[PDB]
Ligand binder design. Structure first.
Ligand SMILES: Cc1cccc(O)c1
Ligand SMILES: Cc1cccc(O)c1
Ligand SMILES: [Zn+2]
Ligand SMILES: [Zn+2]
Lengths: 28, 21, 27, 21
């Protein structure tokens, strides 16, 4: 539902910050 | 996976680092 | 830091475009 | 990769989809 979608948007911004030069995959 | 773990309860940056490459 | 800032916006766009497929982000 | 391609020049939606799984 909508809250999961919105949550995912925050998650990816956080992964971008934490993962640094490693980067990441986002597989829902 | 990440949604199940961190959209149900708050994940810290340490917990999220587990999903990095 | 402009490349860092650009990457932040890229990731939010990939999230929206890719949908259920997801994506990969490597700096 | 994506930074070289899309932070020097604007990428279309179509171009970004190249980076989807
Ligand atoms: C940082 C962050 C974003 C989204 C959900 C979480 O549990 C944590
Ligand atoms: C939509 C988007 C965000 C960041 C850079 C780009 O080239 C395109
Ligand atoms: Zn929000
Ligand atoms: Zn910005």
């Amino acid at each position: 539902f909508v809250n999961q979608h919105l949550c995912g948007s925050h998650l990816v911004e956080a992964l971008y910050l934490v993962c640094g030069e490693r980067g990441f995959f986002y597989t829902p | 996976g990440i949604v199940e773990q961190c959209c149900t309860s708050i994940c810290s940056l340490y917990q999220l680092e587990n999903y990095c490459n």
